[PDB]
Amino acid sequence: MKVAVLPGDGIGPEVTEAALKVLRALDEAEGLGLAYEVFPFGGAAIDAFGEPFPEPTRKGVEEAEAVLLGSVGGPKWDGLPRKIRPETGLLSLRKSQDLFANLRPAKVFPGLERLSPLKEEIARGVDVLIVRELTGGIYFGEPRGMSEAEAWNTERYSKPEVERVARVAFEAARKRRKHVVSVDKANVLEVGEFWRKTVEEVGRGYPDVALEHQYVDAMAMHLVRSPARFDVVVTGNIFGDILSDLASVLPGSLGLLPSASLGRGTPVFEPVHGSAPDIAGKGIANPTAAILSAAMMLEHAFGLVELARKVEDAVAKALLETPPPDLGGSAGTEAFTATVLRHLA
Amino acid sequence: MKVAVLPGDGIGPEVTEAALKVLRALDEAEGLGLAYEVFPFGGAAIDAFGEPFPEPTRKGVEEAEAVLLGSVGGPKWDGLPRKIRPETGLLSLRKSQDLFANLRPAKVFPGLERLSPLKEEIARGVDVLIVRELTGGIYFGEPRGMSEAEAWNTERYSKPEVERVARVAFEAARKRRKHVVSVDKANVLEVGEFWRKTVEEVGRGYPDVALEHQYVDAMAMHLVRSPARFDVVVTGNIFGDILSDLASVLPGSLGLLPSASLGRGTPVFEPVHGSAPDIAGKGIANPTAAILSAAMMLEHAFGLVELARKVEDAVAKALLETPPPDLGGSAGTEAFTATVLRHLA
C-alpha cells in the first residue's frame, strides 16, 4: 500500500496525522502492508522550493498507489503570481495524473439528522455519491470570448470524455447500492442528448446496475425533497458543480465531507474543508473528513470496501459520543481520533 | 383595467373564476374599473376553432393590458400533432408578446412551515422571487450541434438581452425589500463576467436597490441553507431554470405557486400547477395559485402593490383557517374563496 502523503497547509498536517493514525492501526490489525512518505506541497512547498508542486513530490505521487492530501492555501500565499499560487499546485497535480472524475459523497450519519437543513424524515438515510466530470464542458470549451456587445462560451463534449466518467460512476455504484442516475438536459440541449445517449451505451456493460436519467432542473428538486432515494449520481462538469454543492449542504457541516479524484494516474483523496489557518496548531481541528477521505482511499484506490465501511462506522459512532468543537463539542483532534480507534477495535 | 381571461383546460376555468370572484370583489370596494373578457385557449380553443391560440383570442390579449391564464392541455389533446398541441399555444402566446422575463416567487406562508422540506427555523420567512431570462442563453445559442463523436452548444449573451431582464428585476425589487442578487459563473465563464458587469451598470440606475453578485454554485447552497435572506434573485436562462425549480420545493406544495411573464407585449400571469383533469369538476381545487396569480397581476401589470399585499395576506389566513383538501383540509374551492373574500374586507 504505497501512499504519498501531501499534508499541505494550515490544519492539513493536523488532520492528516489523524488519518494516518487510523491507517497505521488498521495495518497493525489486517496487515495491509502500508508504506507512506510525506511530501511538501502547496504553501509549504512554496516556502522551501519556490513552487507549490516540487519535483520530489511530482515524482513521489507518480510512484505512489494513492495520494492522501491535506489542505492547501493560506492568506500568506494567496496573492502571488498564478504560476506559483498554492491553488495552482492542485491543478498541476490533477493535470499530471489525468484525474477526470471528482467524487463527492454526502451522508447523514445515523444520529446527526439534527444538523441537516432538511426535516428529519427527509435527511434520515441520505448517502449520495456525486461523480462529476472535471475536464470538459462549458468550462473549457472553445470558442469563448467577450466584447461590449456580447460574450460567448461553448459547452462541448466528446464520446471518450463521457465514457470515462460514466465508467467510474458505474464502477463506484457496483461497490454501493448499484443504482446510478445520469443527469443532463437532453430535452433541450444537444449535449444533453449526446450525454444520455453515450451513458446508455456504457450502461450496457453494467446490466446489473440500475441506470436512470434525470434532467438537471428536475434533479435539483429531488435532492432537496427526497435525497435519500439516491445512490450514485453522475453528471457533466458545470452541473457537477451545482449538484455537488447542493448535495454538500445536506449533511450540515463542511468538516465531515471527504473527496476524491480518480483518473488514469494516481488517485487523490482529500477533505473538502479549507486550510483554516487561524485554528492551525491549536489542536481542535475536526479530522472526520481526512479520516473519511482515508476510508474512501481504502474503498477506491485499493478496493477494500469492507474496511472502508468499518472506518466510517467508527467515525459515525465517534461523532455521537465525542463531537469535535464544530459539532458543539470538546473532543479535539487527538482525543476524537482516539475514540475512533476504540471502535475500530 | 382591461384583463384578457384565458381560463384554459381541466381545473383551469374553476380556479380562474375564483380569482375573478376576488378581482370583482376588489373592484367594488376599491373602485378599480375592472374590465375583462374570457377567450378560448388551449384544448378548449382546439375543440372550437381547430387550434389552441385562434385569432379571436390573439386579438383579445393585444387589446388587453394583462392576461389571466388558467391551466392548459390534457389527455384529449395530448395525442395531437405538435403544431396543434395545447402546449404549443403557450409558446405562441409567449412568443407573440415578446415575453422575456419569467417571475417565479416562492414563499413559505406564516403558519404553513410544516409543509416545507426544510426545518421550520430555516423555512420561516422565505419570500424569494426569481427572475429568469427566457429568450437568450445556451437554449438558443449558436453554434450548436451534434455529430457522431462530439456535441457542442453555445452559451451566448448580449448587452441588450442582459439589460432588459435586469431592469425587470430591479423594478421588482423596489416593490419588495429593495435587495437584488444576480447569479452567474463569472469566476470561470466569459459570459458570466459579461453578465455581471452589465447588471452592475443597470444597477447604477437604481441607487436604492442593494445589489450583490453570487456564483450559481454558491447560490444553490444558499437557497437551501438560508433562503430567508433573499428578495429578488435575477439570473440567465438555464441557471434561472434550475434555481426556480429549486426554490419551488421550499414552500411544500405546487398548488401555492403563481407565476408571471413580463415583456414588451401583454404580461401573462398564471399558476404553475397543471390542469389536473382528474379533479376538474368535483370542487376540491385549491384556488390559491390562481388568486396569487391575480394578486401578481395587480402588483406587476398595474402596480397596485398595496392591493396586491392585501390579497396575499387574505389568502394567507384563508389557508390556516380553511385549508383545502390538498393541504390536509376539507374546504372546497367556493368555500375557501369565501373565506379569502371575508379577509379582503
Q: In degrees rounded to 5, what are phi and psi of residue B211?
A: -120, 125
d(CA A54, CA A147): 39
Collect all residues with Cβ–Cβ distance below 8 Å to A237 and sequence separation of at least 6.
A132, A133, A134, A135, A136, A137, A138, A139, A140
d(CA B124, CA B109): 8
Q: Which residues of A touch B194 (CB under 8 A)?
A: 146, 150-151
Distances (CA, A) of A54 to A84, A109, A145: 11, 38, 33
d(CA B126, CA B108): 5
d(CA A338, CA A330): 13
For residues A11 and A280, is the Cβ–Cβ distance under 8 A? yes
Determine the structural domain holding residue B124 and report its residue range: 1-345
Collect all residues with Cβ–Cβ distance below 8 Å to A19 and sequence separation of at least 6.
A68, A287, A290, A291, A293, A294
Q: Which residues of B touch A146 (CB under 8 A)?
A: 190, 193-194
d(CA B262, CA B299): 12
480518480: which residue's cell? Answer: A262
Write out chain A in H/E/C secondary structure: CEEEEEEEECCHHHHHHHHHHHHHHHHHHHCCCCEEEECCCCHHHHHHHCCCCCHHHHHHHHCCCEEEEEECCCCCCCCCCHHHCHHHHHHHHHHHHCEEEEEEEEECCCCCHHHCCECHHHHCCCEEEEEEECCCCCCCCCCEEECCCEEEEEEEEEHHHHHHHHHHHHHHHHCCCCEEEEEECCCCCHHHHHHHHHHHHHHHCCCCCEEEEEEHHHHHHHHHHCHHHCCEEEECHHHHHHHHHHHHCCCCCHHHCCCEEEECCCCEECCCCCCCHHHCCCCCCCCHHHHHHHHHHHHCCCCCHHHHHHHHHHHHHHHHHCCCHHHCCCCCHHHHHHHHHHHCC
Nearest to B251 by CA among B214, B205, B212, B292: B292
d(CA A178, CA A200): 15
d(CA B258, CA B18): 14
Catalytic residue among B27, B127, B139, B326: B139
For residues A313 and A300, is the Cβ–Cβ distance under 8 A? no
b/e per residue A154-166 (b: at least 16 CB within 10 A): bbbbebebbebbb
CATH number at B23 reads: 3.40.718.10
d(CA B295, CA B26): 11
C-alpha cell at A11: 490544519
For residues A42 and A52, is the Cβ–Cβ distance under 8 A? yes
Are the beta carbons of A150 and B194 separated by less than 8 Å? yes
Closest residue in A to B186 (Cα–Cα): A139
421588482: which residue's cell? Answer: B172
Considering all CA atoms of chain B, what is the largest pairwise distance in Å, rounded to the nearest integer?
A: 66
Q: Which residues of B touch A245 (CB under 8 A)?
A: 217-218, 220-221
CB burial class (10 A; 0-12, 13-18, 19+) of residue A92? middle
CA atoms within 13 A on the CB side of B333: 25
d(CA B226, CA B216): 15
d(CA A322, CA A340): 9
d(CA B145, CA B162): 24
> In residues, how long is chain B?
345
Omega cis (within 30) before B143 = yes
d(CA A213, CA B13): 35
C-alpha cell at B290: 390562481
For residues A301 and A319, is the Cβ–Cβ distance under 8 A? no
Closest residue in A to B239 (Cα–Cα): A217
Omega cis (within 30) before A143 = yes
Are the beta carbons of A241 and B217 separated by less than 8 Å? yes
d(CA A215, CA A196): 10
d(CA B221, CA B214): 11
Q: In degrees rounded to 5, what are phi and psi of residue A104?
A: -135, 100
For residues A5 and A35, is the Cβ–Cβ distance under 8 A? no
d(CA B216, CA B196): 12
Active site residue B215: no
C-alpha cell at A123: 435527511
Closest residue in B to A159 (Cα–Cα): B149
Q: In degrees rounded to 5, what are phi and psi of residue B86?
A: -65, -30
d(CA A85, CA A77): 7
CB burial class (10 A; 0-12, 13-18, 19+) of residue A73? buried
For residues B155 and A155, is the Cβ–Cβ distance under 8 A? yes
CB atoms within 10 A of CB A270: 27
Collect all residues with Cβ–Cβ distance below 8 Å to A124 and sequence separation of at least 6.
A108, A113, A228
d(CA A213, CA A234): 10
d(CA A89, CA A107): 29
Across the beta sheet with A150-158, the strand order is A144-146, A150-158, B150-158, B144-146
C-alpha cell at B251: 414552500
For residues A90 and A72, is the Cβ–Cβ distance under 8 A? yes
Nearest to B73 by CA among B317, B273, B286: B273
Measured in whole angstroms, the distance separating CA B171 from the mean position of its chain's CA atoms is 16
Side chain identity at residue B65, one-letter code: E
Catalytic residues of A: 139, 185, 217, 241, 245
Q: Cα distance from B112 to chain A (closest Cα, Å)?
A: 14
For residues A196 and A213, is the Cβ–Cβ distance under 8 A? yes
> In residues, how long is chain A?
345
For residues B99 and B128, is the Cβ–Cβ distance under 8 A? no
Q: For strand B210-215 and strand A144-146, is the pairing parallel, antiparallel, or unpaired?
A: unpaired
Q: For strand A268-269 and strand A66-71, is the pairing parallel, antiparallel, or unpaired?
A: parallel
Distances (CA, A) of A94 to A16, A98, A163, B26: 20, 6, 19, 64
B133 strand-pairing partners: B101
CB atoms within 10 A of CB B56: 12
C-alpha cell at A110: 445515523
Write out chain B in H/E/C secondary structure: CEEEEEEECCCHHHHHHHHHHHHHHHHHHCCCCCEEEECCCCHHHHHHHCCCCCHHHHHHHHHCCEEEEEECCCHHHHCCCHHHCHHHHHHHHHHHHCEEEEEEEEECCCCCHHHCCECCCCCCCCEEEEEEECCCCCCCCCCEEECCCEEEEEEEEEHHHHHHHHHHHHHHHHCCCCEEEEEECCCCCHHHHHHHHHHHHHHCCCCCCEEEEEEHHHHHHHHHHCHHHCCEEEECHHHHHHHHHHHHHCCCCHHHCEEEEEECCCCEEEECCCCCHHHCCCCCCCCHHHHHHHHHHHHHHCCCHHHHHHHHHHHHHHHHHCCCHHHCCCCCHHHHHHHHHHHHC
C-alpha cell at A29: 490489525
For residues A251 and A107, is the Cβ–Cβ distance under 8 A? yes
Query: Which one of A153, A238, A244, A257 would you mutate to disrupt binding with B, by most B Cβ within 10 Å of its Cβ?
Result: A153
d(CA A253, CA A270): 16
Side chain identity at residue A44, one-letter code: A
Active site residue B245: yes
Are the beta carbons of A119 and B122 separated by less than 8 Å? no
Q: Cα angle at A148 between A145 and A150, to 5 degrees?
A: 50
CB burial class (10 A; 0-12, 13-18, 19+) of residue B313? middle
For residues A182 and A235, is the Cβ–Cβ distance under 8 A? yes
The partner residue sitting opposite A242, judged by closest CB among B138, B150, B220, is B220
Side chain identity at residue B130, one-letter code: I
d(CA A307, CA A332): 25
Nearest to A108 by CA among A284, A316, A339: A316
Nearest to B125 by CA among B100, B106, B145: B106
C-alpha cell at B86: 395545447
A181 strand-pairing partners: A212, A233
Active site residue B185: yes
For residues B336 and B344, is the Cβ–Cβ distance under 8 A? no
C-alpha cell at B229: 435572506
For residues A304 and A311, is the Cβ–Cβ distance under 8 A? no
Closest residue in A to B159 (Cα–Cα): A149
For residues B9 and B44, is the Cβ–Cβ distance under 8 A? yes
* Number of structural domains in chain B: 1
